[PDB]
């Protein structure tokens, strides 16, 4: 009887929001005063006791591709890649006419010995210089083969500095005071559904910005089952993200002992070319295992045969394209590898068995990589980047944990469905790690009726 209004502060009510998230690294690095590219000067040191409150009976709803954290991360990686290579050497005087000949080992030619006139640091004299550089960095201009460099029609081209690292150190994401991040703890949770086990954090997982296509390398694993996510799986234009539960290890390398020149063009600006090769000239193979990947490809299809439950399903390779689109492209120590995956997406799966892999051969499926110096990742139309050569030998040892697929057409050929590795966006790499996070907003002020009143 005789209710009265009463005001409370500190009441657990949240709503949905969209805010600014900031980095948080830790102090297991940051002993040397170096500046790589993912700044980590300005990242706040994370706490050695991160708190996770386990919520009660809450049934919050999530989405895997209506997430705004992905759109922030995709713009925080492009922008942070332009702080560096802003105070660096433009290569506008290199857009000249190049003479050449070929190195004495063909198809292993993939190197070219080039000569060019340069206007030196003193603007009156003409110098003549030599450099070895790869095919896929040239365009034939029109007998003497007389060509020029790949990307002088359409872009300004910038040499990255050495002593500037590319090693993908982890990034946490924190939300400011008065906000929180919700986290899903379900074991096999698809995209876009309700949940029953939800927790709250201030600070996300250790996400590593591995720039990669066709395969997801130093990533995170599922638990007890391989899980397939898609937006609308009956439609073909939506990409398919496959997440594994046991990682498949891969061992790339580049055997060469190449050197580096130092051509000085302009005042205080040195251009680091490739010199000579000391020893033999070889390929750049990678060697994924065979009996270990057979099981993985055979238990992807046990989940694929449920969504399309009559037809036989096959795996076909990609279609033509630029070499940076249709091949597995990644970064290792400072070079950029471009291996093709036709030995992987090869087979035909009738009843979760195949005839395409014999067992009459050997293990260790090989892949032919290829090197490229001029790289225009993220498809900027007027910007490129020249990665200077690393001297010595290169090894990777990556740790494959998932992949990207897309379907082909809707034409009824047979009871046959072709999958092709073709996920055509950079955001798909970072939806694979941010699928279980959602940013909310705390509203701590509440109104309720009870039987208490003021006095005078």
């Amino acid at each position: 009887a005789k209710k009265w209004v009463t005001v409370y502060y500190g009441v657990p009510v949240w709503k949905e929001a969209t805010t600014t998230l900031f980095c948080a690294s830790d102090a297991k690095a940051y002993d040397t005063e170096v500046h790589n590219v993912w700044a980590t000067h300005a990242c706040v040191p994370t706490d050695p006791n991160p708190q996770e409150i386990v919520l009660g009976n809450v049934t919050e709803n999530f989405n895997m591709w209506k997430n705004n954290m992905v759109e922030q991360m995709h713009e925080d990686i492009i922008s942070l890649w332009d702080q560096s290579l802003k105070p660096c050497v433009k290569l506008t005087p290199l857009c000249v006419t190049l003479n050449c000949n070929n190195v004495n080992t063909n198809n292993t030619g993939e190197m070219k010995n080039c000569s060019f006139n340069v206007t030196t640091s003193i603007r009156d004299k003409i110098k003549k210089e030599y450099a070895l550089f790869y095919k896929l960095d040239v365009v034939p201009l029109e007998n003497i083969t007389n060509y020029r460099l790949i990307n002088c029609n359409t872009s300004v081209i910038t040499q990255a500095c050495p002593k500037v690292s590319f090693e993908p150190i982890p990034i946490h994401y924190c939300a400011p005071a008065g906000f929180a991040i919700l986290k899903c703890n379900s074991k096999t949770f698809n995209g876009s559904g309700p949940c029953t086990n939800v927790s709250t954090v201030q600070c996300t997982h250790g996400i590593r910005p591995v720039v990669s296509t066709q395969l997801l390398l130093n990533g995170s694993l599922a638990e007890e089952e391989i899980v397939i996510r898609s937006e609308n799986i009956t439609d073909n234009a939506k990409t398919i993200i496959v997440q594994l539960n046991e990682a498949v290890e891969i061992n790339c390398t580049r055997p060469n002992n190449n050197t580096r020149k130092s051509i000085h063009i302009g005042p205080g600006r040195a251009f680091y070319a490739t010199g000579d090769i000391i020893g033999n000239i070889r390929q750049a193979h990678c060697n994924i295992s065979k009996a270990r990947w057979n099981e993985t490809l055979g238990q992807i299809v046990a989940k694929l045969e449920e969504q399309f439950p009559n037809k036989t399903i096959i795996f076909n390779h990609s279609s033509g394209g630029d070499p940076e689109i249709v091949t597995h492209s990644f970064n290792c120590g400072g070079e950029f590898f471009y291996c093709n995956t036709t030995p992987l997406f090869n087979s035909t799966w009738n009843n979760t068995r195949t005839d395409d892999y014999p067992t009459g051969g050997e293990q260790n499926i090989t892949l032919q990589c290829r090197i490229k110096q001029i790289i225009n990742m993220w498809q900027g139309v007027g910007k490129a980047m020249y990665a200077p050569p690393i001297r010595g030998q290169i090894r990777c040892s990556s740790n494959i944990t998932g992949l990207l697929l897309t379907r082909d057409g809707g034409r009824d050929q047979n009871g046959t469905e072709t999958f092709r590795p073709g996920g055509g966006n950079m955001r798909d790499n970072w939806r694979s790690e941010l699928y279980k996070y959602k940013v909310v907003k705390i509203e701590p002020l509440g109104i309720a009726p009870t039987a208490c009143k003021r006095r005078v």
């Binding site: 005789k2 209710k3 009265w4 209004v5 009463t6 005001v7 409370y8 502060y9 500190g10 009441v11 657990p12 009510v13 949240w14 805010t19 600014t20 998230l21 900031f22 980095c23 700044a39 000067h41 300005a42 990242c43 706040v44 040191p45 708190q51 409150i53 919520l55 009660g56 009976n57 809450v58 925080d76 922008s79 942070l80 702080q83 400011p176 005071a177 008065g178 929180a180 709250t200 201030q202 705390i442 509203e443 701590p444 002020l445 509440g446 109104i447 309720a448 009726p449 009870t450 039987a451 208490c452 009143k453 003021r454």
Partner: protein, 118 residues
């Protein structure tokens, strides 16, 4: 983050030193600090004008109108779990703020002054 631990319980059961550089991680940290200080001060500014300045439980002198809700006290303090109660009275809240602003403070301060001249 001491809140949110009773987010599923019922309503009665819950009874460093770095130079500012204008780079891409510096702008975000500065925006986060300004957001935090503003979002604290608007809640303190609302609590100040209701006479509830330094408290977490504050009774008032505004009678509860049954057009806002018709339920019973032990019906809502034993079943309803604050998210649902906030979704229920979400249409009537701003009006209630005005009744807290006038009819419990403007009539309390002036009349208090009329007692002080004795």
């Amino acid at each position: 983050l001491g809140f949110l631990g009773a987010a599923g319980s019922t309503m009665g059961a819950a009874s460093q030193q770095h130079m500012l550089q204008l780079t891409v991680w510096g702008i975000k940290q500065l925006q986060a600090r300004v957001l935090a200080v503003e979002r604290y001060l608007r809640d303190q500014q609302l609590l100040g004008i209701w006479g509830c300045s330094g408290k977490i439980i504050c009774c008032t002198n505004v009678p509860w109108n049954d057009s806002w809700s018709n339920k019973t006290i032990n019906e809502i303090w034993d079943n309803m779990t604050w998210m649902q109660w906030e979704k229920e009275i979400d249409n009537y809240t701003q009006h209630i703020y005005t009744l807290l602003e006038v009819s419990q403070i403007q009539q309390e301060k002036n009349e208090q002054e009329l007692l002080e001249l004795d």
